[PDB]
Amino acid sequence: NEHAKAFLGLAKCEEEVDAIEREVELYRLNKMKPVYEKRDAYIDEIAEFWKIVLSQHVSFANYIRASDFKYIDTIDKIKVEWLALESEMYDTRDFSITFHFHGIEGDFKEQQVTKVFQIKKGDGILTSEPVPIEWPQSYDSINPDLIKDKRSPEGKKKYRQGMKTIFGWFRWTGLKPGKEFPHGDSLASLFSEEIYPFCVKYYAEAQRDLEDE
Amino acid sequence: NEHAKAFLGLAKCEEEVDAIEREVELYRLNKMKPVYEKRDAYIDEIAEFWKIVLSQHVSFANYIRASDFKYIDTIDKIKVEWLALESEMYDTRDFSITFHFHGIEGDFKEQQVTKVFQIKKGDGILTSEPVPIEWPQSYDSINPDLIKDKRSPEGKKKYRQGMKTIFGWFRWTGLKPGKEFPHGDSLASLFSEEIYPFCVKYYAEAQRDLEDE
Amino acid sequence: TGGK
Amino acid sequence: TGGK
Amino acid sequence: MSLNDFLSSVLPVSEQFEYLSLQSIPLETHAVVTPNKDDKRVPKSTIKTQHFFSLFHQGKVFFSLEVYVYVTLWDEADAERLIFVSKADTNGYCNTRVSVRDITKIILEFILSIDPNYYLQKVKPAIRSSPELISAASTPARTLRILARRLKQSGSTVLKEQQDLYLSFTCPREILTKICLFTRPASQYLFPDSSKNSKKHILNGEELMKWWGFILDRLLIECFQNDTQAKLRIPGEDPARVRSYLRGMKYPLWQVGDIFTSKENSLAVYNIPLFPDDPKARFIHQLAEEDRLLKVSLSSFWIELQERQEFKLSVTSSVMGISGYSLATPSLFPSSADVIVPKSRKQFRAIKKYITGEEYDTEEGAIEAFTNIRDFLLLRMATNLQSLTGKREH
Amino acid sequence: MSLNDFLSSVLPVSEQFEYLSLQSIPLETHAVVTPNKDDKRVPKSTIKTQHFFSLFHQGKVFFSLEVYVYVTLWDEADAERLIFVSKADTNGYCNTRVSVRDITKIILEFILSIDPNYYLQKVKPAIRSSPELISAASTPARTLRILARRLKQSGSTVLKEQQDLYLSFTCPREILTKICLFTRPASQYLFPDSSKNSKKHILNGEELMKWWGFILDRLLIECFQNDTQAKLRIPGEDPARVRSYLRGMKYPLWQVGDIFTSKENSLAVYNIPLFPDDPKARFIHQLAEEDRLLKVSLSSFWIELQERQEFKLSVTSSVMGISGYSLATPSLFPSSADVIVPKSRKQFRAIKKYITGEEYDTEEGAIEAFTNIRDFLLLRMATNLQSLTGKREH
Ligand SMILES: CC(=O)SCCNC(=O)CCNC(=O)[C@H](O)C(C)(C)COP(=O)(O)OP(=O)(O)OC[C@H]1O[C@@H](n2cnc3c(N)ncnc32)[C@H](O)[C@@H]1OP(=O)(O)O
Ligand SMILES: CC(=O)SCCNC(=O)CCNC(=O)[C@H](O)C(C)(C)COP(=O)(O)OP(=O)(O)OC[C@H]1O[C@@H](n2cnc3c(N)ncnc32)[C@H](O)[C@@H]1OP(=O)(O)O
């Protein structure tokens, strides 16, 4: 009978440790928030900081069209925000990503976009919601909202092309596998977990004296 | 010149985040200590708890001689302690492991041993120090301290045999690669990171009604 | 996580 | 981390 | 005669050996061949069992073999059994010399002798049936709570079991016996890294095919009836070419082809058997993805199999197939000494891993495999390998 | 003539193609062959460069080739160059038909024509030399601090460069020219997954060997002198057997063996060249671990190479070797249109990855490779693939 006691207790811990982790995590989430606040303030004073980070990061290039770099060169700011702080109605793993583009004369508009990523039930996969963005004028041909029929032969062709641009990544949801931007979730995670948290490590590496890094 | 300011600041953060992580980590280390205190109290009331956990854990069997199980069946307690709490002179990753064996009549002595594992400089590898333990009387033949010459042909043979027992794992240091217990560091980490922290998950799995788990 |  |  | 008799009659005289016949619990599984919906006769039940063997010499393991036996029941008395030979390996740590060829043939004779009804006594169902059970679907909390409310109410923490949930069948002692295997040499199959050992003899593609072909030949003559069906197929080769190897065989009925022919449903997927780690299964599942399963005829399957690299850039491989009735009526429930049937998949895996999980780039692994295997049997199972007194002259 | 002339003279008439000749920055590296301590002549410097090519048709890539050229200097005028052919691939997404064989031979003619002195102008040293530099050994803090104290003191954040730290050599325009390659078919080498494409033609071992053997034959006749050394070696085969293939060759001096013979230092390690991803390098480094390097003679090396699986369980592979002087004096510094020399290893890798990094199990990847390659060249490098008007009848 003293065994029924031990066991009944161990179960309490078992339902506890779940809610405990949520805590050790939110602690970090909090400790880090103001830290990025400061760091970002400095970063915002540095010219071309993000253009440089995103052309230095080796893995990032792989996810997107070479041509997207003309527009990626225009990113003034990237701010990652972990939702679990603004309400316990969010997974400690959920987060939003805000970009700011300074546009280009007669081609790409100036704009600031926030894509939201949150885990959905089923261990949970990461998902998102489409968000508006002004595709460059150059990308008219492959613009999904400039294509009359996505199912037509020349229609599926141009569409799948636009879905490989980083603009196409803003539609990604996670629910239409094989249909949307490729590995949209891996890229998001790259931002939240590598690029954003280590932008400075990459800026400093871009800054090597002597061409050959 | 306002750029020399931004940069000089970013560097401060850079030397900071190192000491910040150390903090978010020690927080967890602390939050979890009393939690294991409670949980262990219950566990200590459960008969054969650890004997059961260690025969259920599938991966653990791989590291050690089948025969060692006769002695492993005798483990009353396993307590893992993260050193970083008792003085900031330790890596947040350092830890000690305490075992208690209830011995066996005329073969294996009763005893309690604590092996210490701490990271050494060079990203750091995990290392340990040998610690005394009373090898079973059955294991005389392969007892390193019962072998006259480890370099002799029949001497290197018996020695390498004893170095595959879990008793041989108590000598492991991490500094004589290929010479000591195989993967002693991986096993240690298995204890600190999987077995100890999830003993209860495995006890509950051992407890499946119907032979076939 | 293919990468291209 | 071979495992046997 | 017993497994113990068989091996001894092929190992050198006066010599001592030990061996392990491990056997899975016969599990009711899906059909060996993918059935079509609109079909008159589809399988009633498919019973799958694994036989895994190892030989030891002077405290070292040196050989292992992994064979699945499949018993398919169509109805009351319409049954059929298939022996599928998956893997066979050596690590070249035998101090003495032996004919692996004869050991391998012998072990298959043995398997052929077993009365099919043996796998039909108690069969583990694919999915089984007053609640309150602790199963895979039981969080640890649930489980601990359960053990709590089961202690508070009952003296202990166990239940009731009479417990019969565990299938049972019968079929004729003499049925259609099939043997299927796919030759494909490789550096090792069951002894990891053993290829790094100098003393280990590796057969090449053409050497292996003949090796296997001879063993089946022996089994065809000695163990089957004179009208048995023996088919050979060498992907990437000419029917004239295969007929030439076959002129080597001592059995008269060897023909080119396979034993899947059947003009009924001339479509690959409804004919090709799917075995563990088999290239046939491989290429089939490849079509399932790229959606062509209902478009590749049996005839095309073989022609396409040859392409798509794999075969195109690998050494000689052959598909052997046998289908007939055995001379003697197979009727032999193996004794506790013929086989060791672990309590669960979990224990089965664990004992196997002591062998197929070791590293054999040195004698150490092969010695370790031996001790760990006996220590364990003795400790956790209260048994011990069988000892053999070889009795074969020269 | 130029690279542009060469390719056009082998592609079908009226037809339009595009191509990419990417070239690494000549880097001073260790000796091609492992030198022995107590030796009269050891290399002074070894200059390694990579040439990587791709052909495009109608906005799709379909072929690629990766060749290293090694220039070894013994002293003042005693030099030697070796062209090592690493990989060559197709993805079977060419709408039209072409002789890859002729394209491949042509590109090697071109490479053969290049004056060795070209790789000798500016060479990136293996290890280079007033402090205050930001390099791999510079934590990000250090780097930011540095940029700080370099802003506060100077107008900007850059330094001084005249900067000459960057090696330079010369050698005779006509040297000993070697060509080495190891045939070994595989589903793909530079186009991942392309083997899943139906329209892609894979040669097998014996088909590949003849394929390569014909190209070298052409180069031997047309590009080398009548006393040039041509060696063939087929691991696992009989010297009588190889002599039979050689009777196929149109060049008269093909013999069995290799071009490493040298009775001076009859020991494998001091003779065998070590190339990227080469089986010869492989087997050598295998001995370094298992400590036998100073125990395997050159003769034994070949005999042992054959064993230890790899060759034992794989299709026909050959070692081809050439060593003589070219008919014409190689003297051709390639133009900005013959080659594209990325600013750094980093950019080189990145452009290459657009191609060898794609997935070719569908036309998508091959189209993606093309656009990304031009978009990038134009955007970040202000260039563009070369266009070709094929001019070969029938
Ligand atoms: C469908 C399937 O099950 S496929 C599995 C196939 N397995 C593999 O590819 C794994 C690697 N292969 C091997 O481990 C082994 O070579 C096996 C199992 C194929 C055969 O083993 P062996 O010991 O070579 O065969 P066995 O002992 O019967 O004799 C084979 C021949 O080689 C000879 N032989 C034995 N030892 C050696 C040796 N060290 N060196 C050379 N020859 C040898 C035998 O005399 C015999 O020749 P013979 O016919 O002239 O008498
Ligand atoms: C040392 C090294 O560099 S090793 C690298 C070897 N590479 C590989 O193994 C990678 C895979 N192999 C391949 O991608 C290719 O088959 C290659 C590069 C080997 C050759 O490509 P191909 O296009 O077959 O060769 P090419 O166009 O010169 O013609 C080869 C032959 O096949 C024929 N052919 C061309 N296309 C096809 C096709 N779809 N189907 C069948 N045959 C074809 C040609 O007519 C020619 O035959 P011929 O001699 O009778 O005229």
PDB file of C-alpha atoms and ligand atoms in Angstrom, chain E residues 313, chain F residues 63 65 85-91 97-102 104 181-189 199-203 208 211-212, ligand 2:
ATOM      1  CA  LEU E 313      25.767  -0.856 -61.987  1.00  0.00           C
TER       2      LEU E 313
ATOM      3  CA  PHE F  63      26.100  18.043 -68.832  1.00  0.00           C
ATOM      4  CA  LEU F  65      32.680  17.971 -66.058  1.00  0.00           C
ATOM      5  CA  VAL F  85      39.591  13.990 -64.790  1.00  0.00           C
ATOM      6  CA  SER F  86      37.400  13.692 -61.724  1.00  0.00           C
ATOM      7  CA  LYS F  87      33.736  13.639 -62.721  1.00  0.00           C
ATOM      8  CA  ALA F  88      31.532  13.777 -65.789  1.00  0.00           C
ATOM      9  CA  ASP F  89      27.751  13.518 -65.808  1.00  0.00           C
ATOM     10  CA  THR F  90      24.511  14.024 -67.698  1.00  0.00           C
ATOM     11  CA  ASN F  91      20.955  14.392 -66.438  1.00  0.00           C
ATOM     12  CA  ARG F  97      20.911  15.005 -79.204  1.00  0.00           C
ATOM     13  CA  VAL F  98      24.661  15.583 -78.899  1.00  0.00           C
ATOM     14  CA  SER F  99      27.883  13.573 -78.522  1.00  0.00           C
ATOM     15  CA  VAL F 100      28.852  14.030 -74.861  1.00  0.00           C
ATOM     16  CA  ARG F 101      31.867  11.971 -75.902  1.00  0.00           C
ATOM     17  CA  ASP F 102      32.978  14.668 -78.325  1.00  0.00           C
ATOM     18  CA  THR F 104      34.231  15.844 -73.289  1.00  0.00           C
ATOM     19  CA  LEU F 181      41.577   9.114 -64.713  1.00  0.00           C
ATOM     20  CA  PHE F 182      39.768   6.231 -62.946  1.00  0.00           C
ATOM     21  CA  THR F 183      36.659   4.941 -64.663  1.00  0.00           C
ATOM     22  CA  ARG F 184      33.829   3.959 -62.325  1.00  0.00           C
ATOM     23  CA  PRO F 185      30.232   4.332 -63.477  1.00  0.00           C
ATOM     24  CA  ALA F 186      27.658   5.515 -60.998  1.00  0.00           C
ATOM     25  CA  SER F 187      24.041   6.615 -61.207  1.00  0.00           C
ATOM     26  CA  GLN F 188      25.159  10.262 -60.986  1.00  0.00           C
ATOM     27  CA  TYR F 189      28.157  12.350 -59.975  1.00  0.00           C
ATOM     28  CA  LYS F 199      15.714   9.668 -70.462  1.00  0.00           C
ATOM     29  CA  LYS F 200      19.132   9.527 -68.794  1.00  0.00           C
ATOM     30  CA  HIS F 201      21.590   7.096 -70.354  1.00  0.00           C
ATOM     31  CA  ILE F 202      23.907   5.346 -67.880  1.00  0.00           C
ATOM     32  CA  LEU F 203      26.985   3.520 -69.218  1.00  0.00           C
ATOM     33  CA  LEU F 208      32.348   3.434 -69.729  1.00  0.00           C
ATOM     34  CA  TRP F 211      33.942   5.321 -73.852  1.00  0.00           C
ATOM     35  CA  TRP F 212      36.854   6.954 -72.036  1.00  0.00           C
TER      36      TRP F 212
HETATM   37  C1  LIG G   2      36.728   9.218 -64.734  1.00  0.00           C
HETATM   38  C2  LIG G   2      35.412   9.887 -64.852  1.00  0.00           C
HETATM   39  O1  LIG G   2      35.254  11.035 -65.227  1.00  0.00           O
HETATM   40  S1  LIG G   2      34.105   8.943 -64.446  1.00  0.00           S
HETATM   41  C3  LIG G   2      32.448   9.516 -64.665  1.00  0.00           C
HETATM   42  C4  LIG G   2      31.523   8.515 -65.337  1.00  0.00           C
HETATM   43  N1  LIG G   2      30.195   9.022 -65.107  1.00  0.00           N
HETATM   44  C5  LIG G   2      29.122   8.325 -64.704  1.00  0.00           C
HETATM   45  O2  LIG G   2      29.133   7.118 -64.448  1.00  0.00           O
HETATM   46  C6  LIG G   2      27.842   9.158 -64.578  1.00  0.00           C
HETATM   47  C7  LIG G   2      26.734   8.579 -65.425  1.00  0.00           C
HETATM   48  N2  LIG G   2      26.971   8.427 -66.852  1.00  0.00           N
HETATM   49  C8  LIG G   2      26.496   9.350 -67.727  1.00  0.00           C
HETATM   50  O3  LIG G   2      25.868  10.334 -67.316  1.00  0.00           O
HETATM   51  C9  LIG G   2      26.676   9.254 -69.246  1.00  0.00           C
HETATM   52  O4  LIG G   2      26.223   7.997 -69.748  1.00  0.00           O
HETATM   53  C10 LIG G   2      28.077   9.418 -69.826  1.00  0.00           C
HETATM   54  C11 LIG G   2      28.662  10.793 -69.505  1.00  0.00           C
HETATM   55  C12 LIG G   2      28.987   8.359 -69.224  1.00  0.00           C
HETATM   56  C13 LIG G   2      27.951   9.232 -71.346  1.00  0.00           C
HETATM   57  O5  LIG G   2      26.772   9.851 -71.881  1.00  0.00           O
HETATM   58  P1  LIG G   2      26.161   9.451 -73.301  1.00  0.00           P
HETATM   59  O6  LIG G   2      25.179  10.524 -73.651  1.00  0.00           O
HETATM   60  O7  LIG G   2      25.698   8.040 -73.078  1.00  0.00           O
HETATM   61  O8  LIG G   2      27.287   9.317 -74.417  1.00  0.00           O
HETATM   62  P2  LIG G   2      27.461   9.879 -75.910  1.00  0.00           P
HETATM   63  O9  LIG G   2      26.367  10.917 -76.116  1.00  0.00           O
HETATM   64  O10 LIG G   2      28.894  10.138 -76.385  1.00  0.00           O
HETATM   65  O11 LIG G   2      27.080   8.532 -76.639  1.00  0.00           O
HETATM   66  C14 LIG G   2      27.285   7.303 -75.954  1.00  0.00           C
HETATM   67  C15 LIG G   2      26.613   6.155 -76.685  1.00  0.00           C
HETATM   68  O12 LIG G   2      25.267   5.895 -76.280  1.00  0.00           O
HETATM   69  C16 LIG G   2      24.375   6.361 -77.296  1.00  0.00           C
HETATM   70  N3  LIG G   2      23.242   7.112 -76.673  1.00  0.00           N
HETATM   71  C17 LIG G   2      23.013   8.430 -76.550  1.00  0.00           C
HETATM   72  N4  LIG G   2      21.830   8.669 -75.882  1.00  0.00           N
HETATM   73  C18 LIG G   2      21.296   7.503 -75.572  1.00  0.00           C
HETATM   74  C19 LIG G   2      20.087   7.009 -74.887  1.00  0.00           C
HETATM   75  N5  LIG G   2      19.152   7.833 -74.360  1.00  0.00           N
HETATM   76  N6  LIG G   2      19.932   5.668 -74.799  1.00  0.00           N
HETATM   77  C20 LIG G   2      20.832   4.810 -75.305  1.00  0.00           C
HETATM   78  N7  LIG G   2      21.939   5.199 -75.932  1.00  0.00           N
HETATM   79  C21 LIG G   2      22.225   6.495 -76.097  1.00  0.00           C
HETATM   80  C22 LIG G   2      25.269   7.148 -78.270  1.00  0.00           C
HETATM   81  O13 LIG G   2      24.879   7.069 -79.650  1.00  0.00           O
HETATM   82  C23 LIG G   2      26.571   6.411 -78.179  1.00  0.00           C
HETATM   83  O14 LIG G   2      26.578   5.182 -78.909  1.00  0.00           O
HETATM   84  P3  LIG G   2      27.546   4.963 -80.155  1.00  0.00           P
HETATM   85  O15 LIG G   2      28.950   4.853 -79.604  1.00  0.00           O
HETATM   86  O16 LIG G   2      26.965   3.663 -80.668  1.00  0.00           O
HETATM   87  O17 LIG G   2      27.385   6.182 -81.056  1.00  0.00           O
END
